[PDB]
Design a protein around this ligand. Structure first.
Ligand SMILES: C[C@H](CCC(=O)NCCC[N+](C)(C)CCCS(=O)(=O)[O-])[C@H]1CC[C@H]2[C@@H]3[C@H](O)C[C@@H]4C[C@H](O)CC[C@]4(C)[C@H]3C[C@H](O)[C@]12C
Ligand SMILES: C[C@H](CCC(=O)NCCC[N+](C)(C)CCCS(=O)(=O)[O-])[C@H]1CC[C@H]2[C@@H]3[C@H](O)C[C@@H]4C[C@H](O)CC[C@]4(C)[C@H]3C[C@H](O)[C@]12C
Ligand SMILES: C[S@@+](CC[C@H](N)C(=O)[O-])C[C@H]1O[C@@H](n2cnc3c(N)ncnc32)[C@H](O)[C@@H]1O
Ligand code: SF4
Ligand SMILES: [C-]#N
Ligand SMILES: [Cl-]
Length: 356
C-alpha cells in the first residue's frame, strides 16, 4: 500500500474553473466549487457568472414591484414567520381596491412587472385573484403571482385572467428534508405544481433557500441539478434566516458567501434565466443585493407593500425597514441600478432564449 496525498488547492480551483468554463457540470465539479473556501477562487467564480450574465441577459436590471397583500397562511412551514402556528403576529388582508390602486402607483413609478405574493390565504382563491389580475393587466405591465400550491384549475383560471409568470420556489430538492420542514405537503406536490405551471405556459420560477437545518453541500448540488434539469425561467435563491417565533429560531443562519456561490453557479448553469438579488440577500449583508447583482443576478424586487401592512409580512427578522416612507423602494432601486452602472429594464424583461 502507498500514500494518497491531496492536490494543491489553487490548481484544483483553476481546474474547477476550467471545467465550469467548458460547461462540464458533473456533480463532483459542482460539489468542489461549493466546497472550496478560497477568496480568490470565489472571486473568479463570481467574475465568470458576471461575464455570462453580461453576455446572455445584458445590462438591464428588471424591477419587479412586490405587493405582499395578505399574510394569512393555511400552511405551517417550520422556517416561515407566517406559519399558521405563529400566534405572535398580527394578520392582515388587503382589499382588491387597495391592491389594484397600490399596483397602479407602482406602475406610475415605473415598475414594469407587479408581483402579487401572499400566504396561502383561501379567502382570495381563485376568483378574487382573477379579478385583481385582470385589472392590473389593463395597466400595460407583466403580472407575476406567488401564491403557493393550488389546484390546476386555479392556475388555469389565473393564466386565462392574464397572469404572465408564477414564482414557486422549490425550497429544497431533498424530499426527506422538504417534508420535515413543510409538514403540510411534499416535494412531489411542489414539483407537480411547477410542472403544471410550465405546461400552462407561465414563465415559471423555482429556487431554494441556502443553509436550512439539515441541508448539506450535497443537497445544494442537488438543487443546482434540479434547476438545470427543468430550465426554469426564473430562479430565486436566498439564505435561510431563522425567525424567533418558529421551531427553527435557534438554528444557524444561512451563509452569505455560499448563497452568492449558488447564485453564481445558477447563472453559469442557466445563462439566460432571470435571477433576482433577493430581499434576504439584502437583509443578511448591507449592500447584499448590490453584491449579488455583480455575481450573476439581473432582477431586483423592491417591496411595495404599503403601511401599515408592510411590517407584518414578517417572513424572517430584518426583512422590512420602516425608516422610510412606503413609496421609497422603487426610486431607491433605480438609484442603486444607476450607481452600479446598469440600466433599468426597457420592456417587461421576460425570459428569452438566446443561449444555445
Ligand atoms: C471568464 C472568467 C471571468 C475568467 C475568470 C477566471 C478565468 C480562468 C482562470 O484564470 C484559469 C484558466 C486560465 C482558462 C482559465 C480556465 C480561465 C478562463 C476564464 O478567463 C476565467 C474563467
Ligand atoms: C461594495 C463593494 C466593495 C468591494 C466589492 C467586491 C469586491 O470588488 C470583490 C468582488 C468582485 C466581483 O467582481 C464582484 C463581487 C465582489 C464581492 C465585489 C462586490 C461589491 O462590488 C463590493 C463588496
Ligand atoms: C413566504 S412565501 C409566500 C408565497 C407562497 N406562500 C410560497 O410559500 O410559495 C415566499 C418565500 O419566502 C421564503 N422564506 C420563508 N421563510 C424564510 C426564512 N425564514 N428565511 C428566508 N426565506 C424565507 C421562502 O423561500 C418562500 O418561498
Ligand atoms: S413559506 Fe409560504 S406556504 Fe409556508 S408558511 Fe410561509 S407563507 Fe405559508
Ligand atoms: C425576492 N426578491
Ligand atoms: Cl417576475
Amino acid at each position: 500500500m502507498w500514500s494518497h496525498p491531496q492536490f494543491e488547492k489553487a490548481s484544483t480551483g483553476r481546474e474547477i474553473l476550467e471545467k465550469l468554463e467548458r460547461r462540464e457540470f458533473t456533480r463532483e465539479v459542482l460539489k468542489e466549487a461549493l466546497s472550496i473556501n478560497d477568496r480568490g477562487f470565489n472571486e473568479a467564480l463570481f467574475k465568470l457568472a458576471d461575464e455570462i450574465r453580461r453576455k446572455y441577459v445584458g445590462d438591464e436590471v428588471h424591477i419587479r414591484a412586490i405587493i405582499e397583500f395578505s399574510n394569512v397562511c393555511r400552511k405551517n412551514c417550520l422556517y416561515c414567520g407566517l406559519r399558521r402556528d405563529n400566534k405572535n403576529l398580527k394578520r392582515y388582508r388587503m382589499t382588491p381596491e387597495e391592491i389594484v390602486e397600490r399596483a397602479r402607483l407602482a406602475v406610475q413609478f415605473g415598475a414594469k412587472t407587479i408581483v402579487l405574493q401572499s400566504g396561502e390565504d383561501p379567502y382570495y382563491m381563485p376568483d378574487v385573484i382573477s379579478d385583481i389580475v385582470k385589472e392590473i393587466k389593463k395597466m400595460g405591465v407583466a403580472v407575476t403571482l406567488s401564491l403557493g400550491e393550488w389546484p390546476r384549475e386555479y392556475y388555469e383560471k389565473w393564466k386565462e385572467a392574464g397572469a404572465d409568470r408564477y414564482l414557486l420556489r422549490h425550497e429544497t430538492a431533498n424530499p426527506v428534508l422538504h417534508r420535515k420542514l413543510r409538514p403540510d405537503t411534499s416535494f412531489e406536490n411542489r414539483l407537480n405544481c411547477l410542472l403544471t405551471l410550465k405546461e400552462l405556459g407561465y414563465e415559471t420560477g423555482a429556487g431554494s433557500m441556502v443553509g436550512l437545518p439539515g441541508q448539506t453541500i450535497d443537497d445544494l448540488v442537488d438543487d443546482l441539478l434540479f434547476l438545470k434539469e427543468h430550465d426554469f425561467d426564473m430562479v430565486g435563491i436566498g439564505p435561510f434566516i431563522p425567525h424567533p417565533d418558529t421551531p427553527l429560531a435557534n438554528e444557524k443562519k444561512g451563509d452569505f458567501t455560499l448563497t452568492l456561490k449558488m447564485v453564481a453557479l445558477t447563472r453559469i448553469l442557466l445563462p439566460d434565466s432571470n435571477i433576482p438579488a433577493t430581499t434576504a440577500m439584502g437583509t443578511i449583508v448591507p449592500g447584499g443585493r448590490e453584491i449579488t447583482l455583480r455575481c450573476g443576478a439581473n432582477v431586483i424586487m423592491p417591496n411595495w407593500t404599503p403601511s401599515p401592512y408592510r411590517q407584518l409580512y414578517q417572513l424572517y427578522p430584518g426583512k422590512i425597514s420602516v425608516f422610510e416612507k412606503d413609496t421609497a423602494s422603487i426610486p431607491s432601486v433605480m438609484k442603486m441600478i444607476e450607481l452600479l452602472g446598469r440600466k433599468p429594464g426597457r420592456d417587461w424583461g421576460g425570459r428569452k432564449r438566446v443561449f444555445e
